[PDB]
């Protein structure tokens, strides 16, 4: 993360959908950062768990992604990610990310979409 600019940082709880069960499972709580690589100009989400500092999200903010609401929340987004490497080899997930307030959630979407435009350049 030495070669990266922090465009945005927000406290968040990340979930992944377990389709075999039929439930959301927490993956981590901590600072979710949008990081722009200064050499390549590509923007990624990188999120680490509090205390252990383990990566729970590491993926490019792909222009193809779309943030959708969850039925139970006015302060969360759900989206399909096709290449997250937090746990090792690239893997597809359906993520949900929840924030401390609706205001933070709405700011995340705005920043997410700005980052998508950067990645289109």
């Amino acid at each position: 993360e030495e070669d990266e600019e922090v465009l945005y940082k927000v406290r968040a709880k990340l979930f992944r959908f377990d389709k075999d069960a039929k439930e959301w499972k927490e993956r981590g709580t901590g600072d979710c950062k949008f990081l722009k690589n200064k050499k390549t100009n590509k923007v990624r989400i990188l999120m680490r768990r509090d205390k252990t500092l383990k990566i729970c999200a590491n993926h490019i903010i792909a222009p193809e992604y779309t943030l959708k609401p969850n039925v139970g929340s006015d302060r969360s987004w759900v989206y399909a990610c096709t290449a997250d490497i937090a746990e090792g080899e690239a893997e597809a997930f359906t993520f949900a990310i929840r924030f401390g307030s609706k205001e933070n959630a709405d700011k995340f979407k705005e920043e997410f979409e700005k980052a998508q435009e950067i990645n289109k350049k």
């Binding site: 039925v71 139970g72 929340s73 006015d74």
Partner: protein, 1017 residues
């Protein structure tokens, strides 16, 4: 697969295969490891697997295989030993003894297979518990004799003896009957003279050895129970406190032994014995000082370095010094020649108290509490410790943990922010630290003030300035409130506040300002006596807190709200009166500007603010004036409410706005907050909103139902429906809160109850399970608790509406609808207490469900439910007994007496409800005593089942013997008869009755329990 071969007992056991399965489990990974685990458990659990143990021990090349063989034998010995033919018992004893001898006589095996030899030793001890001394009388003499033939065997014998002592004295209470425990304790006691002789000889003849260490480990266990003469009438104390403190390998265990020596029961008025107690302490401290470290050593640094066993040693030293001194420091306080020893031991404790290790600090702090609490009372003692206490003041003042009130903390990036969560695990630590510092302040108020005031001078002039240093000092200053006289305190507090304000002027930037603000808020909130005597100051503090309610720093803002209510809780009188030179009581000033003051607060903070105002208003005892203040306080929520009631009555659709739902919730929450502090005084405000609030409850209930109908059960998860249910929950909370505090119960019944029941009961009954609020049950519990005796028909209505439908939600498993489960049994409990007649009015089928529900509660492992179930059962039995010889009571006993007896026995004996033992025993004793005292007026048996004249006593014994015979078929008839005879005889003596139950619970876990155990007395 191939590994499963060992499970086929129709073929010879392939020991090589077993060793492979075992190796795969312990040393493998993933799927293969998991499969091997499953196979080994199945192998171990085969009731014939013990028959393979000998073969495994002889032919296996895997020590873990042999360990598992021994575990199989352990299970057999502990549960089925007396089921075996006698030759199998002899054979097993012989090959266990022989394996132990064989492994001890081979030096390489003795060195490298400690785990296996220890397991073998424990397995031997299990056999001793069954066989010794009655069928193994020479075990101890032969062990003692064998000790001289081999140093390995001697060492191993010390391990066997340690384990035997543990199993007999330390761990027998749960595992043996009272009678068997006494037998084994008496047996060990009778042969201990010869055991000690061996131990002492070994200790005399060696200095530092694995044999010496094992011997000392055994001694540690003996010290739990042996007579003090073995320690004081031999030379053993000299050896422990000199020789064995010098070598580090024996030092650790010797120190632990000396700690337990300090706990021996010892004659109180024997000068010789006192001299010996002083001498071993003197010797031990001399050895520490010469062989380990001098009194000046930096133990904080040593501990932090964490070399070898230093942390454990310093822990054990703290335990030794605190244990000994708490009991014996008086022995060292009067003789001038012992003063240096006394003060040196305490100086080591001072050094230990500087170590950074919270759990060790709690241990030393407990000691300091013991000391300072004694010095506070005992004439002529505090002067002895004046230098120790002065050092301790510095230690505590420098290591004060953050109080729960201080809501700011430094993050990893060096910024001062609001805490993420409460530091719950330092609550007790802070209280303990405060306790000690308060005593220390009392012991020398001049020293304490001088230390604090000079430390503050060093913060101001910058020499010692740091957040850490100003914080710990400020926390210390706040923590000693109450120690000084009002007059002395007045001067102290003035000096402190002037200096904190000076410090603030000098320190710039939001981080610095947040730290110093937090410290000033903490201190001022801790000195309400000062605030009460200084109105201009108090007024100015409050105005400053209002300024902080507009802080962008959320930690300072939140702390200002908490500090406001903390001050108001203690100083409220001064806000309600008109102070000299003020134009109005300050409560008027607060209320008039409440919109501006609270504009930047979050809703819950606004509610706290209103709650504080309520505290002040309840100081006004003139009713007209108090009601006027309440009306003034509630002006803004009432005006918002009035406009919403106008709109919502016009349009049920306008309530569908999420913004409006949030507004309503916050209005009701504001009412809850004020009602919480005003209680009975809140009634006029409740009356203003009551009828429209219940109409709103109905309207919101209709919206919730419509949404579930249109969208499915998933609607209950949506923000909109959760918001609507919040309105219902807060309305219920408001009514519960008021009724819980109401003083006019006639008005509660005549005005509040009928409309409440009308609004909430049918709605609860007629919603689907997932839309029912457990808060309804909670509200009804309080209604019944406070006015149940006045509303018999209302209580019947409550049961009709909530009983069967709630029971059906919670009677399919123990986990679904956890809040309903808990509130349901609280409700049944209070109805059974306050309005039992409601249960008498139930149709018989519903009364049967009530009994079913009670027994269902028994079977919960959740304590909130289980405890209430057992209490309802006991209360119900009492309620029935109070009715006397009447048809309802007679029918109750005929229908349900044996149901309660059998269900109580079931949870007593299933090993899954151990938490409820005491209350289960109480219930069973009540039931048995009903028959013992002939309080049941009709036969419990149907006629022709037994001869016509047969007593309920005879029938109860017959019923119970048959029940136990069928439920526990491995018990003998005499075990059952003897148990029941004792239990029934003991049904007026709870402690003895419980002992008999515990003995039964032991015997059911094994075969061949002695029926004479139930004669224990």
């Amino acid at each position: 697969g191939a590994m499963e071969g060992i499970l086929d007992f129709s073929n010879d056991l392939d020991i090589a295969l077993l060793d492979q399965v075992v190796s795969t489990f312990y040393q493998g990974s993933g799927v293969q490891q998991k499969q091997a685990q499953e196979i080994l458990t199945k192998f171990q659990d085969n009731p014939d697997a013990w028959q393979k143990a000998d073969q495994i021990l002889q032919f296996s090349t895997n020590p873990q295989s042999k360990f598992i063989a021994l575990s199989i034998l352990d299970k057999l010995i502990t549960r089925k030993w007396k089921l075996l033919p006698n030759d199998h018992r002899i054979g097993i004893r012989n090959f266990v003894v022989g394996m132990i001898i064989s492994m001890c006589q081979d030096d390489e095996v003795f060195k490298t297979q400690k785990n296996l030899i220890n397991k073998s030793d424990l397995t031997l001890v299990q056999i001793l518990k069954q066989e010794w001394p009655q069928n193994w009388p020479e075990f101890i003499p032969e062990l003692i004799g064998s000790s001289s033939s081999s140093v390995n065997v001697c060492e191993n014998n010390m391990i066997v003896l340690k384990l035997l002592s543990e199993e007999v004295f330390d761990f027998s209470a749960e595992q043996m009957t009272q009678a068997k425990a006494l037998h084994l304790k008496n047996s060990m006691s009778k042969e201990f003279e010869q055991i000690f002789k061996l131990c002492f000889q070994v200790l005399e003849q060696g200095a530092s050895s694995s044999l010496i260490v094992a011997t000392l480990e055994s001694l540690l266990r003996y010290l739990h129970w042996i007579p003090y003469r073995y320690i004081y009438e031999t030379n053993i104390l000299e050896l422990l406190s000199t020789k064995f403190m010098t070598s580090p390998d024996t030092r650790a265990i010797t120190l632990k032994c000396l700690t337990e020596v300090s706990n021996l029961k010892i004659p109180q008025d024997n000068d010789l014995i006192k001299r010996q107690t002083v001498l071993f302490f003197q010797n031990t401290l001399q050895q520490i000082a010469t062989s380990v470290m001098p009194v000046t050593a930096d133990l904080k640094a040593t501990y932090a370095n964490a070399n070898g066993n230093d942390q454990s040693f310093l822990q054990d030293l703290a335990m030794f010094l605190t244990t000994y001194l708490a009991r014996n420091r008086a022995l060292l306080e009067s003789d001038e020649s012992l003063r240096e020893l006394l003060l040196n031991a305490h100086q080591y404790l001072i050094q230990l108290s500087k170590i950074e290790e919270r759990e060790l600090f709690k241990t030393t702090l407990d000691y300091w509490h013991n000391l300072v609490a004694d010095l506070f009372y005992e004439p002529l003692k505090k002067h002895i410790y004046e230098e120790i206490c002065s050092q301790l003041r510095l230690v505590i003042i420098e290591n004060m943990v953050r109080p729960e009130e201080v809501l700011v903390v430094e993050n990893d990036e060096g910024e001062i922010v609001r805490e993420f969560v409460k530091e719950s695990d330092t609550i007790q630590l802070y209280k303990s630290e405060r306790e000690v510092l308060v005593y220390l302040t009392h012991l020398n108020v001049i020293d304490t003030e001088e230390i604090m005031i000079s430390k503050l001078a060093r913060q101001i002039d910058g020499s010692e300035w740091s957040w850490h240093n100003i914080n710990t000092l400020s926390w210390a200053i706040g923590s000693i409130s109450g120690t000084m006289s009002e007059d002395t305190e007045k001067r102290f507090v003035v000096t402190v506040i002037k200096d904190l304000l000076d410090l603030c002027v000098k320190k710039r930037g939001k981080d610095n300002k947040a730290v110093v603000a937090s410290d000033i808020m903490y201190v001022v909130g801790q000195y309400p006596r000062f605030l009460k005597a200084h109105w201009n100051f108090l007024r100015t503090v409050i105005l400053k807190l209002f300024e902080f309610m507009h802080e962008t720093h959320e930690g300072v803002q939140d702390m200002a709200c908490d500090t406001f209510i903390k001050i108001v809780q203690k100083c409220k009188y001064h806000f309600v009166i008109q102070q000299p030179r003020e134009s109005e009581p300050f409560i008027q000033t607060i209320i008039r500007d409440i919109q501006k003051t609270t504009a930047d607060l979050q809703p819950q903070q606004v509610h706290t603010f209103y709650k504080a105002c309520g505290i002040i208003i309840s100081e006004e005892r003139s009713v007209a004036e108090r009601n006027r203040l309440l009306s003034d306080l509630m002006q803004l929520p009432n005006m918002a409410w009035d406009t919403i009631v106008e709109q919502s009555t016009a349009n049920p659709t306008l309530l569908l706005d999420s913004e409006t739902v949030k507004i309503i919730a916050n209005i009701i929450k504001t009412n809850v907050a004020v009602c919480t502090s005003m209680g009975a005084d809140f009634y006029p405000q409740l009356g203003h909103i009551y009828y429209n609030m219940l109409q709103l409850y109905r309207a919101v209930s209709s919206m919730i139902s419509a949404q579930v109908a249109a969208e499915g059960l998933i609607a209950t998860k949506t923000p909109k429906v959760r918001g609507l249910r919040t309105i219902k929950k807060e309305i219920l909370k408001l009514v519960e809160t008021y009724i819980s505090k109401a003083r006019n119960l006639d008005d509660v019944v005549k005005v509040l109850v009928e409309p409440l029941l009308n609004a909430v009961l049918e709605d609860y009954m007629n919603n689907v399970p997932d839309a029912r609020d457990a808060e309804v049950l909670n509200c009804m519990t309080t209604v019944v608790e406070k006015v149940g005796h006045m509303i018999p028909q209302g209580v019947i209505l409550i049961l009709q509406s909530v009983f069967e439908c709630t029971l059906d939600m919670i009677n399919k498993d123990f986990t679904e609808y956890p809040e309903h489960r808990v509130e349901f049994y609280k409700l049944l409990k209070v109805i059974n207490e306050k309005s039992f007649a409601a249960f008498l009015e139930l149709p018989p089928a519903a009364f049967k469900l009530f009994v079913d529900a009670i027994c269902w509660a028994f079977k919960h492992n959740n304590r909130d439910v289980e405890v209430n179930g057992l209490q309802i059962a006991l209360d119900l039995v009492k309620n029935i007994e109070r009715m006397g010889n009447v048809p309802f009571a007679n029918e109750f006993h005929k229908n349900y007496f044996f149901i309660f007896v059998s269900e109580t026995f079931f949870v007593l004996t299933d090993s899954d409800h151990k938490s409820g033992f005491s209350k289960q025993a109480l219930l069973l004793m009540k039931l048995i005593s009903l028959v013992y005292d002939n309080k049941i007026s009709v036969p419990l048996y149907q006629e022709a089942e037994v001869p016509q004249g047969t007593s309920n006593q005879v029938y109860l014994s017959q019923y119970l013997a048959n029940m136990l015979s069928n439920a526990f078929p491995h018990l003998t008839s005499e075990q059952i008869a003897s148990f029941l005879s004792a239990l029934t005889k003991q049904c007026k003596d709870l402690v003895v009755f419980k002992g008999t139950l515990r003995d039964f619970l032991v015997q059911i876990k094994e075969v061949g329990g002695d029926p004479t155990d139930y004669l224990f007395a």
